[PDB]
Design a protein around this motif. Sequence first.
Motif, short mmCIF file in Angstrom:
data_model
loop_
_atom_site.label_atom_id
_atom_site.label_comp_id
_atom_site.label_asym_id
_atom_site.label_seq_id
_atom_site.Cartn_x
_atom_site.Cartn_y
_atom_site.Cartn_z
N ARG B 3 39.71 -17.36 123.68
CA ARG B 3 39.14 -18.72 123.76
C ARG B 3 37.66 -18.67 123.39
NH1 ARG B 3 39.44 -23.11 128.57
NH2 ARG B 3 39.05 -24.93 127.22
N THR B 4 36.94 -17.69 123.91
CA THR B 4 35.50 -17.57 123.60
C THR B 4 35.27 -17.26 122.11
OG1 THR B 4 34.95 -16.96 125.84
CG2 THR B 4 33.48 -16.14 124.12
N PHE B 7 35.83 -20.34 120.14
CA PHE B 7 34.67 -21.21 120.38
C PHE B 7 33.52 -20.78 119.44
CE2 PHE B 7 32.52 -23.16 124.41
CZ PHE B 7 31.75 -23.97 123.62
N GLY B 11 32.33 -23.16 116.57
CA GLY B 11 31.13 -23.79 117.14
C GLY B 11 29.84 -23.23 116.57
N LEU B 12 29.87 -22.01 116.00
CA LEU B 12 28.66 -21.35 115.47
C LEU B 12 28.92 -20.85 114.06
CD1 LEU B 12 25.89 -20.11 115.67
CD2 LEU B 12 26.93 -18.08 116.74
N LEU B 19 26.41 -25.19 106.74
CA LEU B 19 24.96 -25.42 106.49
C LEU B 19 24.51 -24.62 105.26
CD1 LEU B 19 23.73 -25.39 110.17
CD2 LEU B 19 23.55 -27.33 108.58
N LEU B 22 25.82 -26.26 102.11
CA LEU B 22 24.94 -27.44 101.85
C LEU B 22 23.67 -26.99 101.13
CD1 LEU B 22 24.51 -30.41 102.40
CD2 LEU B 22 26.66 -29.51 103.35
N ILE B 37 12.03 -11.90 75.13
CA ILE B 37 11.12 -10.80 74.73
C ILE B 37 11.96 -9.54 74.64
CG2 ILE B 37 9.10 -9.41 75.36
CD1 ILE B 37 8.14 -11.86 76.99
N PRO B 38 11.99 -8.85 73.47
CA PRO B 38 12.87 -7.68 73.31
C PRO B 38 12.35 -6.40 74.01
CG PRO B 38 11.70 -8.16 71.25
CD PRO B 38 11.28 -9.23 72.22
N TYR B 39 12.09 -6.51 75.32
CA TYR B 39 11.67 -5.36 76.14
C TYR B 39 12.67 -4.21 75.96
CZ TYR B 39 8.28 -8.26 78.71
OH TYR B 39 7.24 -9.04 79.10
N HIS B 40 12.12 -3.01 75.86
CA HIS B 40 12.89 -1.78 75.56
C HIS B 40 13.56 -1.24 76.83
CE1 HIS B 40 11.81 -1.42 71.30
NE2 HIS B 40 10.71 -2.11 71.69
N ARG E 65 4.35 -1.00 71.26
CA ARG E 65 4.90 -2.08 72.11
C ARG E 65 3.83 -3.17 72.33
NH1 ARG E 65 9.11 1.80 75.54
NH2 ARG E 65 10.31 2.23 73.66
N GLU E 68 3.99 -5.22 69.29
CA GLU E 68 5.30 -5.93 69.20
C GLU E 68 5.37 -7.12 70.19
OE1 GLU E 68 10.08 -5.03 69.20
OE2 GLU E 68 8.76 -3.66 70.42
N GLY E 69 4.55 -7.08 71.25
CA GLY E 69 4.59 -7.99 72.40
C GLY E 69 5.64 -7.57 73.43
N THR E 70 5.98 -6.28 73.52
CA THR E 70 7.02 -5.77 74.44
C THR E 70 6.45 -4.79 75.46
OG1 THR E 70 7.67 -4.04 72.90
CG2 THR E 70 8.90 -6.15 72.80
N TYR F 179 34.71 -21.55 131.76
CA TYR F 179 35.11 -22.87 131.31
C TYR F 179 35.71 -23.71 132.46
CZ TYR F 179 34.30 -20.14 127.11
OH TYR F 179 33.70 -19.35 126.15
N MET F 271 34.03 -29.42 126.95
CA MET F 271 33.74 -28.23 126.11
C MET F 271 32.68 -28.62 125.07
SD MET F 271 35.23 -25.52 127.24
CE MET F 271 35.59 -24.32 125.94
N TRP F 275 29.22 -26.69 124.46
CA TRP F 275 28.87 -26.37 123.06
C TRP F 275 27.47 -26.93 122.76
CZ3 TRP F 275 27.92 -30.03 119.25
CH2 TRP F 275 27.61 -29.49 118.00
N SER F 279 24.23 -24.78 121.77
CA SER F 279 23.69 -25.03 120.41
C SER F 279 22.20 -25.36 120.51
CB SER F 279 24.46 -26.11 119.71
OG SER F 279 25.78 -25.71 119.47
#
Lengths: 72, 72, 227, 75, 75, 513, 258, 56, 44
Positions: B3-4, B7, B11-12, B19, B22, B37-40, E65, E68-70, F179, F271, F275, F279
């Motif tokens: 049950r807990t 819950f 509930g949590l 959230l 969202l 940019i063609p970085y190596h 580099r 080249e701008g790299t 409870y 309950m 809760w 909370s």
Amino acid sequence: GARTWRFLTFGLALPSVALCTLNSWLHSGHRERPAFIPYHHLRIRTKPFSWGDGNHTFFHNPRVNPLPTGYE
Amino acid sequence: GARTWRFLTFGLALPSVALCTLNSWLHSGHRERPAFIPYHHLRIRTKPFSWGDGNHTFFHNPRVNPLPTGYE
Amino acid sequence: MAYPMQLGFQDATSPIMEELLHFHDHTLMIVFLISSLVLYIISLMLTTKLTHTSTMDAQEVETIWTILPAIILILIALPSLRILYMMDEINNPSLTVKTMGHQWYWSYEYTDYEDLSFDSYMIPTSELKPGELRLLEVDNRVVLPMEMTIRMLVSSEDVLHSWAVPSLGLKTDAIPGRLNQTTLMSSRPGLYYGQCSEICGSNHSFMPIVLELVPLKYFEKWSASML
Amino acid sequence: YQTAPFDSRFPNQNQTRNCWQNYLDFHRCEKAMTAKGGDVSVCEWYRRVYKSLCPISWVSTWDDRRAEGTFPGKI
Amino acid sequence: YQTAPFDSRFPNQNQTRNCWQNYLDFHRCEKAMTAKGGDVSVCEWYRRVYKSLCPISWVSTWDDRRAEGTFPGKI
Amino acid sequence: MFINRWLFSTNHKDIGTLYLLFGAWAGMVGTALSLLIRAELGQPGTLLGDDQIYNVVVTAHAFVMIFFMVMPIMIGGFGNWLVPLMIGAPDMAFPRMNNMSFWLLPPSFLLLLASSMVEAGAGTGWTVYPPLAGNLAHAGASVDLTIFSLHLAGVSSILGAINFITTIINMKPPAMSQYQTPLFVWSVMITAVLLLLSLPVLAAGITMLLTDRNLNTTFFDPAGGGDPILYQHLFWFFGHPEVYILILPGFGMISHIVTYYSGKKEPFGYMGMVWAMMSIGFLGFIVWAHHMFTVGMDVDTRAYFTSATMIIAIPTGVKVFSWLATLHGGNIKWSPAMMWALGFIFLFTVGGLTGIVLANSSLDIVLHDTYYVVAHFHYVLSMGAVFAIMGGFVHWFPLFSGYTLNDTWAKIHFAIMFVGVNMTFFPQHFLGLSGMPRRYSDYPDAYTMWNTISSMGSFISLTAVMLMVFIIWEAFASKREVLTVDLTTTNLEWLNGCPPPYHTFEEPTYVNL
Amino acid sequence: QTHAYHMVNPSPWPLTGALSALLMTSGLTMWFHFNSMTLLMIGLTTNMLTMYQWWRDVIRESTFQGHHTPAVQKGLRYGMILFIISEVLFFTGFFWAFYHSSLAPTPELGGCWPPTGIHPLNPLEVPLLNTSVLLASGVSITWAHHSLMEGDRKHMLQALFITITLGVYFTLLQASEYYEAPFTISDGVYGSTFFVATGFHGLHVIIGSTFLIVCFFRQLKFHFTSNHHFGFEAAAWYWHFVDVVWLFLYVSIYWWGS
Amino acid sequence: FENRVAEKQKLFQEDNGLPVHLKGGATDNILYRVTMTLCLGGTLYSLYCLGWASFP
Amino acid sequence: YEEGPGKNIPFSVENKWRLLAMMTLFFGSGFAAPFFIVRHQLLK
Ligand code: HEA
Ligand code: HEA
Ligand SMILES: CCCCC/C=C/C/C=C/C/C=C/C/C=C\CCCC(=O)O[C@H](COC(=O)CCCCCCCCCCCCCCCCC)COP(=O)(O)OCCN
Ligand SMILES: CCCCC/C=C\C/C=C/C/C=C\C/C=C\CCCC(=O)O[C@H](COC(=O)CCCCCCCCCCCCCCCCC)COP(=O)(O)OCCN
Ligand SMILES: CCCCCC/C=C/CCCCCCCCCC(=O)O[C@H](COC(=O)CCCCCCCCCCCCCCC)COP(=O)(O)OC[C@@H](O)CO
Ligand SMILES: CCCCCC/C=C\CCCCCCCCCC(=O)O[C@H](COC(=O)CCCCCCCCCCCCCCC)COP(=O)(O)OC[C@@H](O)CO
Ligand SMILES: CCCCCCCCCCO[C@@H]1O[C@H](CO)[C@@H](O[C@H]2O[C@H](CO)[C@@H](O)[C@H](O)[C@H]2O)[C@H](O)[C@H]1O
Ligand SMILES: C[C@H](CCC(=O)O)[C@H]1CC[C@H]2[C@@H]3[C@H](O)C[C@@H]4C[C@H](O)CC[C@]4(C)[C@H]3C[C@H](O)[C@]12C
Ligand code: CUA
Ligand SMILES: [Cu+2]
Ligand SMILES: [Mg+2]
Ligand code: NA
């Protein structure tokens, strides 16, 4: 069981302490103290301490703890 | 007990997922892709990939993944 | 400044204060409606001899009680956060002015070009000129150009203060060792008042802020005169 | 030059580091230009920016500490 | 000047960052001095140190580099 | 025998009685301070001629009302009286430690009244922010005595929280699950968890302030690389949980009162109520920086704290609607306690809603450090806590004393108090919107009309307080001994009579599975 | 009664404890401001007398009178766990202060951590030894626990003696460290965070060591059974808490913060 | 050492009406009187100190 | 210990007028204290 934890105590834990003791004792020599610089973020005095002359920290060591004006 | 933990599930835990769903939903939508940019150190090709033309990554997205020579 | 018997905000002097007024109108309508609904429902629950005292099932109604409030909160948060991100948006200021809080007065620094600085003290009630405002006037106002984006930097040389101008939507804490930034833009010329807004000791009530907003040409003439 | 422009390094309400960094940059550049007898006009951008942003009392305290040998930043 | 002195920033066997830092420092200083039309001679210490420490092929690749701008470092 | 019983107590009922007496006395102090505030503001200009003393009065007003009136009454008084009775337990888990939680409070209060009598007092605000609270701007003993007052109050409440959590978890009938415990007991357990986690953080922060004042530490001093804003984070990390601590036992009492006077065997949606309290307790730890929207934090941080703060309205609304649904279909008894509870539901709702306005960081720029905030918390905290306390007090007075109140007098008392608090605090909304700062000894002339009305309201509430003392006297003076109360089948605390014997549940209840 | 819970005799110790708190706090005020140690030494004396007589009475109630039924012991277990939790949160505040200061070092420090002019301790020398000492004491106290459960008086006493000896060694090493440290509590936020966080930890080591010493003497006097020894369990839990706080201090302040 | 717990059980279970804090004998009374005298005397001294500190 | 209405409290309700005096001193002392502390601070 107790026998296993004694085995760990004497076979691993205390040997570890013995090795760290040897490591510390080999590096225990006095370091050369750095030049005094009266940095404003250190040796803070906003209120006198409530002991001695108000200007010495609780576990002041003359060899390594300079006052606001320098080493004693 | 069961049950807990039920819950906590309803509930949590599931409210947290709702959230965060969202939050993700609200921040979805395409951001403007940066100048190519063609970085190596990027678009590494030491051996052709074992699929397609050898030059496209496995989950290649033409909108955001440039080839070594730039955007398609 | 505020006027007698005022119920709401000071009239907006800046575009961001205008936005806040519209956002408060939206939010207050919701506050009124929810307050009124709760009072009405109390009155409805208390005005019938009809009874039902056996156990009631709560599941169905709790969906309404959680979903409807969640929707309302989203409808408040969306415009709230739009304004938050507007009030952070990159502006190109044409002027930076610093203010430093002290116990108990403000100083101002205009150091873009000249080292201009001055102190700004409350006019004591015994020294007010006829028609001047008790606790609000200062000796040296913050002269600024109207219809221009200004960067204000706020700090303190002692305790916490807070630099506020309600009609411009401004309140920035003045913290020693910290330089806090805010943007100021006045749609109009005139005098705009505020008051220290972090408790700073015995004269917290008595260190006001007065902006004097003038056309750029008059701001430049004032700056040039200060040499 | 009117005032210090937006700096993407310091985009938030706390501008403390912007003032500090330009003060350091100006004094690092000034030391570099003086040491070869070079030209401090090269340092002018940093001078204008720190002068615009930094409280006078911060500048004055930092100047005093540099002269004392107690300035804690590296120049 | 004989060779690059000991630098306490780089005290270990791996001297990669020492080469890299002096190459960056030279090119930053050169850009700062050329933009005002000031004097690149103030940058000379960094030039001598990176030329002493850096493999020719690393310098050559980094120069290519930048053209080249790299180049991935900030100059 | 008198010293053994009242100084050496190990009895939950006698210790609860000590807390109620202590709290009622503290309430008189707090009220006197509040009237001095409103007398200074009741016309333009200066009354006291000493704004440091005004600031000391404001500071003491808050500490007395929070630490010496609300928490002792709700947790020490109603908690100690009711929790063991509601679970059929023979006492608290730690009955001797319970007595030390009580006896720490008089010394704590003495340190606060020492702070105000030495030097020029602690004119800091109850937030005690450095550097105003530091050894330059507040040199001398006053702030240190305030810190020590808070250390003793904090130890009292931490040990009390340990006692309540242990009692509630360990000392129910073996068949009774969590409870099957009443909502008031849930409200105290949750409150105790918040105290256990929040107070140690306050203790750390005020200890840092103590060491900055006396041992040349610089936690909060920029000269040493410290930061006044760190203090604010540590204070508010405690302070937001603290405001839920102040209301949660109130929510528990309201659930019992609404159920009882609606003639119901049970609250609507049990309950859901559990809760909602759990909370609120959890969300209460992740929202603190809404007290800091003007200090210069990052925009994304402001966005997060706005959004997280607004979430608390959802579980809170479940409780409000559940109280309404408990009234629904009731055979309503218009007792004075029911009037207090209905006043609570409405006034709490108003204050909660102005909290939601403030949660919006953008608008909070203009409302922060104004009378809008003062109006918000005097609705939700001041009226909410006090209305729940007065409802619980008139409901349970016959249990605790064995004597009945005069219901007509109690209704008159309610009516006077309802007028006084609304006349006092409602106009403070206008003062806030129009830009009047809080923590001011005087105001620009424009603000005169609403300050005048607010101060007149404060005297109406004083008349209510004086009448309350007369009403308690009249009950003890007349000695109408209780025979019977209705609904004992769903209100176990009444089933041992009025007052219950010193020892109850020597033979525990029988509850089968 | 026909329940298993303990109705405690009316006791003066709550009141003497509360008054000891007033004397210690008013005493610290009178030491910091009015140049006098008198009230403070009365308060410390009454505090020690109160803790001695209160816990003596708990021993009388349990070992000598039989009031600790399983239900009572279960409650004390919860109480000690909750107390440790409160102490964790107290330390959390000091860690928060440390991380706040060290992650965003201000211009006054040189805008770096450690600050300009601070020479930290080498974390591989005495701090590492202290780490090995407290970890070793966590092993020895576990041996003591198992020895007691197995009914072995001699090995319980030897294991507990070794645990206490390691706690004392840590305390003497830390005292030595404090004296040799070239920085002080007045060395800005570095010294503030270092000494206040390690100093509250050192106080908790002294408290924990004292609790283990009480358990050692109760064991010498045969108070504990192989099944019923909550005072030992609580002292072990507290000792593990002291170990774990040290490991977080070591990693945070001594190692990462160096 | 010898196990003398049974002898302490007998002492602390004696039907003499004493509360547990006094049940050990005359030494308990002495220690209680020392504690309470220091606490009450100390508290009176703290109030005197308050009176002194409340004025310049 | 004494049990029952009027006997579970640290004050006597045996005489309603003695009670009125005790309640007057009790709540009055608390209400008065802040006025006398303000007076004490002003007289500094
Ligand atoms: C009982 C004490 C208590 C309680 C419970 C609360 C509850 C809330 N508080 Fe308040 N608060 C204080 C006591 C309290 N507060 C105090 C003392 C201060 C000042 C501290 C100081 O500076 O000295 C303060 C200050 C404070 C601030 C700082 C303002 C500033 O200084 O600038 C904020 C910011 O968000 C805040 C928000 C809230 C919110 C959102 C709630 C929420 O928990 C409210 C939730 C309740 C409701 C919303 C009403 C019921 C709900 C419904 C009927 C459902 C439908 C509703 C909607 C869809 C909106 N409060
Ligand atoms: C529980 C908290 C609580 C309570 C009850 C109150 C009650 C009152 N408060 Fe307030 N107050 C605060 C908490 C509280 N306050 C806080 C936290 C601050 C901020 C301090 C700061 O800025 O640092 C504040 C500040 C504050 C200010 C702002 C000061 C300023 O900014 O300069 C004002 C102004 O009018 C004020 C007025 C009042 C008044 C007139 C009352 C009352 O007169 C209203 C009527 C209520 C009563 C009279 C109480 C009755 C209860 C009893 C007598 C107990 C009875 C006991 C039993 C039945 C067992 N208080
Ligand atoms: C060896 C390992 C452990 C040693 C334990 C310490 C010995 C003395 C005091 C014990 C109490 C310790 C707790 C922590 C409190 C503060 C400071 C203690 C840390 C310490 O000992 O730090 C010393 C300074 O002590 C100082 O200022 C002086 C300190 C003395 C006065 C402290 C008074 C403050 C008490 C604060 C009370 C707070 C209680 C909180 C209760 C909360 C309940 C909710 C460091 O010496 P130093 O010369 O600066 O540098 C060394 C240079 N060679
Ligand atoms: C939803 C995520 C789940 C993963 C499933 C997807 C893919 C197949 C299986 C995955 C197994 C995991 C790891 C293996 C290695 C690489 C794959 C990493 C995950 C992945 O799928 O990486 C992709 C690349 O896949 C590639 O190269 C494809 C590589 C496919 C062949 C894999 C080679 C197998 C390697 C051998 C495994 C050895 C196992 C050893 C066991 C130990 C024995 C002692 C990423 O796509 P991209 O287009 O580059 O970037 C996205 C751009 N928009
Ligand atoms: C030179 C010294 C300077 C420092 C002084 C400061 C104080 C140091 C004090 C050290 C703590 C000593 C605690 C001794 C407790 C002895 C009583 C005890 O241990 O009592 C046991 C119950 O535990 C119980 O109450 C558990 C009781 C838990 C006690 C918890 C103590 C930790 C307290 C910390 C103090 C606060 C510190 C916070 C500061 C920030 C008794 O039950 P058993 O053991 O099952 O025996 C029964 C069997 O014999 C049956 O067969
Ligand atoms: C500037 C300096 C200010 C500081 C002032 C210090 C404040 C007060 C003076 C403290 C005097 C302490 C005297 C000893 C208290 C012993 C309490 C204890 O040990 O309480 C036990 C319960 O708590 C348990 O176990 C678990 C709880 C044991 C807690 C022990 C005491 C802690 C005191 C300080 C704690 C602060 C916490 C730090 C975190 C912020 C026993 O409960 P009892 O009801 O007695 O008996 C029940 C019987 O069935 C037992 O046979
Ligand atoms: C058993 C119950 C307990 C009873 C309480 C005992 C009360 C003892 C009273 C003694 O009072 C002392 O007098 C000293 C001398 O007059 C003061 O010395 C101090 O004050 C001096 C003032 O001259 C200064 O020189 C120094 O700070 C210092 O010596 C000290 O502060 C103060 O405590
Ligand atoms: C001989 C005696 C027996 C105790 C007994 O059963 O009463 C022994 C058993 C375990 C002994 C202890 C443990 O051996 C551990 C310690 C060993 C040290 O060398 C002396 C002290 C020390 C703390 C011992 C004291 C004493 O000699 C004890 C207590
Ligand atoms: Cu400056 Cu308030
Ligand atoms: Cu909050
Ligand atoms: Mg503020
Ligand atoms: Na006034």
